[PDB]
Amino acid sequence: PDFLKLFLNHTPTFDMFSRFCFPSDPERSLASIVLQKLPQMGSPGDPTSLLVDFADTLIDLWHQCLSERYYGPIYHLVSLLLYTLDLNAVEVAPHILSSLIPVCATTCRLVALPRLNSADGDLSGHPDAVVRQLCLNIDVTQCLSVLYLAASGCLPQPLPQDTPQLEFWKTMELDFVLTMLSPKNPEEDWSAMMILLRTSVAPHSIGPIPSSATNSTNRRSEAKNADAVAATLIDCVSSFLCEPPKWATPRSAKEIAARLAALRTLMAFATGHFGARQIAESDVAIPRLVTVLCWALDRLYDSDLPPDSMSLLHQIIAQGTRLLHFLVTDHRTSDAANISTKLAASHGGSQRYFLTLARLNFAEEDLVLEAGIDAETVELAHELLELAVTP
Amino acid sequence: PDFLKLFLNHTPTFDMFSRFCFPSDPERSLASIVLQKLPQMGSPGDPTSLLVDFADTLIDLWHQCLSERYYGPIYHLVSLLLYTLDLNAVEVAPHILSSLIPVCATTCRLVALPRLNSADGDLSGHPDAVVRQLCLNIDVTQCLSVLYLAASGCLPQPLPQDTPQLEFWKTMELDFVLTMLSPKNPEEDWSAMMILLRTSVAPHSIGPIPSSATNSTNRRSEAKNADAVAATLIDCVSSFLCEPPKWATPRSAKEIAARLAALRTLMAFATGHFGARQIAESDVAIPRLVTVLCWALDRLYDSDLPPDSMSLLHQIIAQGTRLLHFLVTDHRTSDAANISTKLAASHGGSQRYFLTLARLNFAEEDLVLEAGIDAETVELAHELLELAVTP
């Protein structure tokens, strides 16, 4: 007696890829069809052709798994996509996204939608159905990881049809973004999405691109769509840096990590002219950003301060003042951001803004600031204070 | 900022295969050399050729990892071997074992040897070296799993050079067996080995085959080797069913699981004529086996009895009496086993043997036995009792 016992003890819990078969044909193993379809893959001389054909066979098998809700072999197919895609992602991903992205979307939604319906996002008992097993069977975080690898593969390289970034995010949909960012999601899935959005910075549109009405393009309509998507994502993302997810314990390092991640994605948007302008014109991004600078500074004086929480707080201060200086000082956004008509902290208005700028300027006098914040940070804060004292 | 943040949050802890590079050439990624060596793989029309070439490239890369003690990418190379091998193992493994087995052996030994040197097998602190990280970095259980998959691939099929089983176990070495079975190993590694030994039942030799002295074969010497290896493995394996590893809590279900596994491997040996004869002639196997039957029966009457512990105990009783009946009753082994000159229980000698046979025969009268042990079990126990009462 050999196989049954390895099947017993082998299950961290792992299962063998050869055992899985579709219930539509329970005597044909997945390994079998992969093998008989294998020698037909790839045109000669093109290894990327082989990778594309192979990843296509994986995605098709996973799509069929979803159709028959046989969720066993999802993990292994995702894993093989991670290896095959990681191999030459910049060449392989643009051929794949058309089918890969909707499969990731529905696969993630199988878990995210009951989470979002769940009171606090916990699946323990509350649905009392096959959903309970469904959370255990499929990992969202690896799916999002395949999406992130495919996005980075599509990202523009240093060296007409749309760029592959642009296809990727035209076929990426916004309600998926907003649900995957819902604070009812766990840490790994949420941070996975916040990181994924950094690859959506296109020259005219951050975030995903809504589908066009006709087969012919409408410049006016798309302009309006880009504008709306931008304002919405910036509202969503900026909301976190003043109010992190519930799983960020409200004094823990994870909170600081989350606020830092939100800030990082806003920076990602600001890399492009369009994203920066949209942040500057946002009615909530800047007063939230000022609010979190005041927050992080005041927490740097915290009664008890134990990744290092302190180092993260200095990253929030340095990178956050970097961003705010970029927005207020650059000519492209100055006339919008610097308006600052009540654009300041939530708790104390313009006063706390000016004060936290001062305390950042006098880094030397405060002992915690002398040994902390960089010199260029003090320089930026000094310029911003020089404009802040009088318009 | 994109990659550094996914690299942060992505690490259960997983790392990306593309990042790994050898310190002998820190600017050449593993993915790169895999890709440029990829289109050269396989002869046309042979998909098994492709799998063999690919697995060879993985094993060579892993051997180079061992040489440079760069232990990062071991997990991923093992994992790809698991998929590629699981795909068509019966056709692919015989081409691989020559290089695969010694790499598994030294890879496992990196962890097993400090464990065996450790007082109770715990690596926490006691070495206080790179060994502490070394246990964390490489998983033995997946390595043993690759060995088990390759063994089952070599196992004889229903449809001169030696059989691929026989090469496998000629190149498998016994001190590796005995160290991997040491009770200082964790549950998963130990049970992985006990399961692996079931594939070593050859027509003239169970266990691994020692290397021959000359290039020309010596039938006499090999005969003696097979005899010695058999007696030793049977002593090792039989020792557990009366004295399980330390991690088997001495009343837990895991203990019963372990004794059951040992018994299963002994059964595996008995499938062959040679193994059965060697068990029968063993000076310790039968009195240990009788001892564990008496044990399991007495524990079936245990004060408190909560996988199901009870079901496992019935598996030990049914399969154990099956084996003992096979040994004592079959003509090939009868004249050796049935001698039974003090060949009985350790605690109470021949008395407890005869008594436990009786209680198994009167299954109906005992309520726990009426609802438990099968009818064929009672039949075998009746025959064995009929010989036991008078020789």
CSV table of N, CA and C in Angstrom, one decimal, chain B residues 177-287:
chain,number,residue,atom,x,y,z
B,177,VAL,N,18.7,6.1,5.2
B,177,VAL,CA,17.5,5.6,5.7
B,177,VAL,C,17.4,5.7,7.2
B,178,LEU,N,18.5,5.2,7.8
B,178,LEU,CA,18.5,5.1,9.3
B,178,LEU,C,18.5,6.4,10.0
B,179,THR,N,19.2,7.4,9.4
B,179,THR,CA,19.2,8.7,9.9
B,179,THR,C,17.8,9.4,9.7
B,180,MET,N,17.3,9.3,8.5
B,180,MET,CA,15.9,9.9,8.3
B,180,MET,C,14.8,9.2,9.1
B,181,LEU,N,15.0,8.0,9.6
B,181,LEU,CA,14.1,7.4,10.5
B,181,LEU,C,14.3,7.7,11.9
B,182,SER,N,15.4,8.4,12.3
B,182,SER,CA,15.7,8.6,13.7
B,182,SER,C,14.6,9.3,14.4
B,183,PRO,N,14.2,8.9,15.6
B,183,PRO,CA,13.0,9.5,16.2
B,183,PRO,C,13.2,11.0,16.6
B,184,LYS,N,14.4,11.6,16.3
B,184,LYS,CA,14.7,13.0,16.5
B,184,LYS,C,14.1,13.8,15.3
B,185,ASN,N,13.8,13.2,14.2
B,185,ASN,CA,13.1,13.8,13.1
B,185,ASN,C,11.6,14.1,13.4
B,186,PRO,N,11.1,15.2,12.8
B,186,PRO,CA,9.6,15.5,13.0
B,186,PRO,C,8.8,14.4,12.3
B,187,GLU,N,7.5,14.5,12.7
B,187,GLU,CA,6.5,13.6,12.2
B,187,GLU,C,6.5,13.5,10.7
B,188,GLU,N,6.4,14.6,10.0
B,188,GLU,CA,6.2,14.6,8.5
B,188,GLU,C,7.4,13.9,7.9
B,189,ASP,N,8.7,14.2,8.3
B,189,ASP,CA,9.8,13.6,7.7
B,189,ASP,C,9.9,12.1,8.0
B,190,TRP,N,9.7,11.7,9.2
B,190,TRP,CA,9.7,10.3,9.6
B,190,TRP,C,8.7,9.5,8.8
B,191,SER,N,7.4,9.9,8.8
B,191,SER,CA,6.4,9.2,8.1
B,191,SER,C,6.7,9.2,6.6
B,192,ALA,N,7.2,10.3,6.1
B,192,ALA,CA,7.6,10.4,4.7
B,192,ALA,C,8.6,9.3,4.4
B,193,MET,N,9.7,9.1,5.2
B,193,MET,CA,10.6,7.9,5.0
B,193,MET,C,9.9,6.6,5.1
B,194,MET,N,9.1,6.3,6.1
B,194,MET,CA,8.5,5.0,6.3
B,194,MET,C,7.6,4.7,5.1
B,195,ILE,N,7.0,5.7,4.5
B,195,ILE,CA,6.2,5.5,3.3
B,195,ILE,C,7.2,5.2,2.1
B,196,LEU,N,8.3,6.0,2.1
B,196,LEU,CA,9.2,5.8,1.0
B,196,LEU,C,9.8,4.4,0.9
B,197,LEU,N,10.0,3.7,2.1
B,197,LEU,CA,10.6,2.4,2.0
B,197,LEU,C,9.7,1.4,1.4
B,198,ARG,N,8.4,1.7,1.2
B,198,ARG,CA,7.5,0.6,0.7
B,198,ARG,C,7.8,0.4,-0.8
B,199,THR,N,8.5,1.3,-1.5
B,199,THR,CA,8.8,1.1,-2.9
B,199,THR,C,10.1,0.4,-3.1
B,200,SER,N,10.8,-0.1,-2.0
B,200,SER,CA,12.0,-0.8,-2.1
B,200,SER,C,11.9,-2.3,-2.1
B,201,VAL,N,10.7,-2.8,-2.4
B,201,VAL,CA,10.5,-4.3,-2.3
B,201,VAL,C,10.9,-4.9,-3.7
B,202,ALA,N,12.1,-5.3,-3.8
B,202,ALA,CA,12.5,-6.0,-5.1
B,202,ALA,C,12.5,-7.5,-4.9
B,203,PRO,N,12.6,-8.2,-6.0
B,203,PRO,CA,12.4,-9.7,-5.9
B,203,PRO,C,13.5,-10.4,-5.1
B,204,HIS,N,14.7,-9.8,-4.9
B,204,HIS,CA,15.7,-10.4,-4.1
B,204,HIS,C,16.2,-9.6,-3.0
B,205,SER,N,15.7,-8.3,-2.8
B,205,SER,CA,16.3,-7.4,-1.8
B,205,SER,C,15.3,-6.3,-1.5
B,206,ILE,N,14.9,-6.2,-0.2
B,206,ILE,CA,14.2,-5.1,0.2
B,206,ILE,C,15.2,-4.0,0.7
B,207,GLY,N,14.8,-2.8,0.8
B,207,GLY,CA,15.7,-1.7,1.2
B,207,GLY,C,16.7,-1.4,0.1
B,208,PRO,N,17.6,-0.5,0.4
B,208,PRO,CA,18.7,-0.1,-0.6
B,208,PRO,C,19.7,-1.2,-0.8
B,209,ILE,N,20.4,-1.2,-1.9
B,209,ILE,CA,21.3,-2.3,-2.3
B,209,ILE,C,22.7,-1.7,-2.2
B,210,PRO,N,23.6,-2.3,-1.4
B,210,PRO,CA,25.0,-1.8,-1.3
B,210,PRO,C,25.8,-1.9,-2.6
B,211,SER,N,26.7,-1.0,-2.7
B,211,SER,CA,27.6,-1.0,-4.0
B,211,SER,C,28.4,-2.2,-4.0
B,212,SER,N,28.6,-2.7,-5.2
B,212,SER,CA,29.4,-3.9,-5.4
B,212,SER,C,30.9,-3.6,-5.4
B,213,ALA,N,31.7,-4.6,-5.0
B,213,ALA,CA,33.1,-4.4,-4.8
B,213,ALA,C,33.8,-4.2,-6.2
B,214,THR,N,33.6,-5.1,-7.1
B,214,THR,CA,34.2,-5.0,-8.4
B,214,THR,C,33.2,-4.5,-9.5
B,215,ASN,N,33.7,-4.2,-10.7
B,215,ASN,CA,32.8,-3.9,-11.8
B,215,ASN,C,32.0,-5.1,-12.2
B,216,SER,N,32.6,-6.3,-12.1
B,216,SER,CA,31.9,-7.6,-12.2
B,216,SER,C,31.1,-7.9,-11.0
B,217,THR,N,29.9,-8.5,-11.1
B,217,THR,CA,29.0,-8.7,-10.0
B,217,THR,C,29.4,-10.0,-9.2
B,218,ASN,N,29.1,-10.0,-7.9
B,218,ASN,CA,29.4,-11.1,-7.1
B,218,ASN,C,28.1,-11.5,-6.5
B,219,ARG,N,27.5,-12.7,-7.0
B,219,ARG,CA,26.2,-13.1,-6.5
B,219,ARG,C,26.3,-13.4,-5.0
B,220,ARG,N,27.3,-14.1,-4.5
B,220,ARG,CA,27.5,-14.4,-3.1
B,220,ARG,C,27.5,-13.2,-2.2
B,221,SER,N,28.4,-12.2,-2.5
B,221,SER,CA,28.4,-11.0,-1.7
B,221,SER,C,27.1,-10.3,-1.7
B,222,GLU,N,26.5,-10.1,-2.9
B,222,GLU,CA,25.2,-9.4,-2.9
B,222,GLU,C,24.2,-10.1,-2.1
B,223,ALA,N,24.1,-11.4,-2.2
B,223,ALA,CA,23.2,-12.2,-1.3
B,223,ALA,C,23.4,-11.8,0.1
B,224,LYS,N,24.7,-11.8,0.6
B,224,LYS,CA,24.9,-11.5,2.0
B,224,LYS,C,24.5,-10.1,2.3
B,225,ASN,N,24.7,-9.2,1.4
B,225,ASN,CA,24.3,-7.8,1.6
B,225,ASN,C,22.8,-7.7,1.8
B,226,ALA,N,22.1,-8.2,0.8
B,226,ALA,CA,20.6,-8.2,0.9
B,226,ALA,C,20.2,-8.8,2.3
B,227,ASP,N,20.8,-9.9,2.7
B,227,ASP,CA,20.4,-10.5,4.0
B,227,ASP,C,20.7,-9.5,5.1
B,228,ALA,N,21.8,-8.9,5.2
B,228,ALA,CA,22.1,-7.9,6.3
B,228,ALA,C,21.2,-6.7,6.3
B,229,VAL,N,21.0,-6.1,5.1
B,229,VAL,CA,20.2,-4.9,5.0
B,229,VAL,C,18.8,-5.3,5.5
B,230,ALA,N,18.3,-6.5,5.0
B,230,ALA,CA,16.9,-6.9,5.4
B,230,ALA,C,16.8,-7.0,6.9
B,231,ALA,N,17.7,-7.8,7.5
B,231,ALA,CA,17.6,-7.9,9.0
B,231,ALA,C,17.7,-6.6,9.7
B,232,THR,N,18.5,-5.7,9.3
B,232,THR,CA,18.7,-4.4,9.9
B,232,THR,C,17.4,-3.5,9.8
B,233,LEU,N,16.9,-3.4,8.5
B,233,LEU,CA,15.7,-2.6,8.4
B,233,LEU,C,14.5,-3.2,9.1
B,234,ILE,N,14.4,-4.5,9.1
B,234,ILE,CA,13.3,-5.1,9.9
B,234,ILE,C,13.4,-4.8,11.4
B,235,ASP,N,14.7,-4.8,11.9
B,235,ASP,CA,14.9,-4.4,13.3
B,235,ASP,C,14.5,-3.0,13.5
B,236,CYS,N,14.9,-2.1,12.6
B,236,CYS,CA,14.6,-0.7,12.8
B,236,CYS,C,13.1,-0.4,12.7
B,237,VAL,N,12.4,-0.9,11.7
B,237,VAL,CA,11.0,-0.7,11.5
B,237,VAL,C,10.2,-1.3,12.6
B,238,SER,N,10.4,-2.6,12.9
B,238,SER,CA,9.7,-3.3,14.0
B,238,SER,C,9.9,-2.6,15.3
B,239,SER,N,11.0,-1.9,15.5
B,239,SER,CA,11.2,-1.3,16.8
B,239,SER,C,10.2,-0.3,17.1
B,240,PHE,N,9.6,0.4,16.1
B,240,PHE,CA,8.7,1.5,16.3
B,240,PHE,C,7.3,1.0,16.8
B,241,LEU,N,6.9,-0.1,16.2
B,241,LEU,CA,5.5,-0.5,16.6
B,241,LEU,C,5.4,-0.9,18.1
B,242,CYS,N,6.5,-1.1,18.8
B,242,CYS,CA,6.4,-1.2,20.3
B,242,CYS,C,7.0,0.0,21.0
B,243,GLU,N,7.5,1.0,20.3
B,243,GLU,CA,8.2,2.1,20.9
B,243,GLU,C,8.2,3.2,19.9
B,244,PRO,N,7.1,3.9,19.7
B,244,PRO,CA,7.1,5.0,18.7
B,244,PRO,C,8.0,6.1,19.0
B,245,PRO,N,8.2,7.0,18.0
B,245,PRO,CA,9.1,8.2,18.3
B,245,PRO,C,8.6,9.0,19.4
B,246,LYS,N,9.5,9.8,20.0
B,246,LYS,CA,9.2,10.7,21.1
B,246,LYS,C,8.1,11.6,20.9
B,247,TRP,N,7.9,12.1,19.6
B,247,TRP,CA,6.9,13.1,19.3
B,247,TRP,C,5.5,12.4,19.3
B,248,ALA,N,5.4,11.1,19.3
B,248,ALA,CA,4.1,10.4,19.5
B,248,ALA,C,3.8,10.4,21.0
B,249,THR,N,3.0,11.4,21.4
B,249,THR,CA,2.5,11.5,22.7
B,249,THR,C,2.0,10.1,23.2
B,250,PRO,N,2.4,9.6,24.3
B,250,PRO,CA,2.3,8.1,24.6
B,250,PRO,C,0.9,7.6,24.9
B,251,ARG,N,-0.1,8.5,24.6
B,251,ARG,CA,-1.5,8.0,24.6
B,251,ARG,C,-2.2,8.6,23.4
B,252,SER,N,-1.6,9.3,22.5
B,252,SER,CA,-2.3,10.1,21.5
B,252,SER,C,-2.7,9.3,20.3
B,253,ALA,N,-3.5,9.9,19.4
B,253,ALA,CA,-3.8,9.2,18.2
B,253,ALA,C,-2.5,9.1,17.3
B,254,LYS,N,-1.6,10.1,17.4
B,254,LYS,CA,-0.4,10.1,16.6
B,254,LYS,C,0.5,8.8,16.9
B,255,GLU,N,0.5,8.4,18.1
B,255,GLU,CA,1.2,7.1,18.4
B,255,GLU,C,0.6,5.9,17.6
B,256,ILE,N,-0.7,5.8,17.7
B,256,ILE,CA,-1.4,4.7,16.9
B,256,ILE,C,-1.1,4.9,15.4
B,257,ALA,N,-1.1,6.1,15.0
B,257,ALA,CA,-0.8,6.4,13.6
B,257,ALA,C,0.6,5.9,13.2
B,258,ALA,N,1.5,6.1,14.1
B,258,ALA,CA,2.9,5.7,13.9
B,258,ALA,C,3.1,4.2,13.9
B,259,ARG,N,2.6,3.5,14.9
B,259,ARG,CA,2.6,2.1,15.0
B,259,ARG,C,2.0,1.5,13.8
B,260,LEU,N,0.9,2.1,13.3
B,260,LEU,CA,0.2,1.7,12.1
B,260,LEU,C,1.1,1.8,10.9
B,261,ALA,N,1.8,2.9,10.8
B,261,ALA,CA,2.7,3.1,9.6
B,261,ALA,C,3.8,2.1,9.6
B,262,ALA,N,4.5,1.9,10.8
B,262,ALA,CA,5.5,0.8,10.8
B,262,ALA,C,4.9,-0.5,10.4
B,263,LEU,N,3.7,-0.9,10.9
B,263,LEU,CA,3.1,-2.1,10.5
B,263,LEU,C,2.9,-2.2,9.0
B,264,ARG,N,2.4,-1.1,8.4
B,264,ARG,CA,2.1,-1.0,7.0
B,264,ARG,C,3.4,-1.3,6.2
B,265,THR,N,4.5,-0.7,6.6
B,265,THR,CA,5.8,-1.0,5.9
B,265,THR,C,6.2,-2.4,6.0
B,266,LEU,N,6.0,-3.0,7.2
B,266,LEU,CA,6.4,-4.4,7.3
B,266,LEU,C,5.5,-5.3,6.3
B,267,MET,N,4.2,-4.9,6.2
B,267,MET,CA,3.4,-5.6,5.2
B,267,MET,C,3.9,-5.4,3.8
B,268,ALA,N,4.3,-4.2,3.5
B,268,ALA,CA,5.0,-3.9,2.2
B,268,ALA,C,6.1,-4.9,2.0
B,269,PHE,N,7.0,-5.1,3.0
B,269,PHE,CA,8.1,-6.0,2.8
B,269,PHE,C,7.5,-7.4,2.6
B,270,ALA,N,6.5,-7.8,3.3
B,270,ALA,CA,6.0,-9.1,3.2
B,270,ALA,C,5.3,-9.4,1.8
B,271,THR,N,5.1,-8.4,1.0
B,271,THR,CA,4.5,-8.6,-0.3
B,271,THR,C,5.4,-9.5,-1.1
B,272,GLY,N,6.7,-9.3,-1.0
B,272,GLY,CA,7.7,-10.2,-1.6
B,272,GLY,C,8.0,-11.4,-0.8
B,273,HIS,N,8.3,-12.5,-1.6
B,273,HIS,CA,8.7,-13.7,-0.9
B,273,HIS,C,9.9,-13.5,0.0
B,274,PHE,N,10.9,-12.8,-0.5
B,274,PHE,CA,12.2,-12.5,0.2
B,274,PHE,C,11.9,-11.8,1.5
B,275,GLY,N,11.2,-10.7,1.4
B,275,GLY,CA,10.9,-9.9,2.6
B,275,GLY,C,10.1,-10.7,3.6
B,276,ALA,N,9.2,-11.5,3.2
B,276,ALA,CA,8.4,-12.3,4.1
B,276,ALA,C,9.3,-13.3,4.8
B,277,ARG,N,10.1,-14.0,4.1
B,277,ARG,CA,11.0,-14.9,4.7
B,277,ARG,C,12.0,-14.2,5.7
B,278,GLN,N,12.5,-13.0,5.4
B,278,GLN,CA,13.4,-12.3,6.3
B,278,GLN,C,12.6,-11.9,7.5
B,279,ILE,N,11.4,-11.5,7.4
B,279,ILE,CA,10.6,-11.2,8.6
B,279,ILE,C,10.4,-12.4,9.5
B,280,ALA,N,10.1,-13.5,8.8
B,280,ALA,CA,9.8,-14.8,9.5
B,280,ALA,C,11.1,-15.2,10.3
B,281,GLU,N,12.2,-15.1,9.7
B,281,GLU,CA,13.5,-15.5,10.3
B,281,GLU,C,14.0,-14.4,11.3
B,282,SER,N,13.5,-13.2,11.2
B,282,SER,CA,13.9,-12.2,12.2
B,282,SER,C,13.7,-12.7,13.6
B,283,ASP,N,14.6,-12.3,14.5
B,283,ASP,CA,14.6,-12.6,15.9
B,283,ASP,C,13.8,-11.6,16.7
B,284,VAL,N,13.3,-10.5,16.1
B,284,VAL,CA,12.6,-9.5,16.9
B,284,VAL,C,11.2,-9.1,16.2
B,285,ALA,N,11.0,-9.3,14.9
B,285,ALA,CA,9.8,-8.8,14.3
B,285,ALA,C,8.6,-9.4,14.9
B,286,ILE,N,8.5,-10.7,14.9
B,286,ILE,CA,7.3,-11.4,15.4
B,286,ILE,C,7.0,-11.1,16.8
B,287,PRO,N,7.9,-11.2,17.8
B,287,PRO,CA,7.5,-10.9,19.1
B,287,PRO,C,7.1,-9.4,19.3
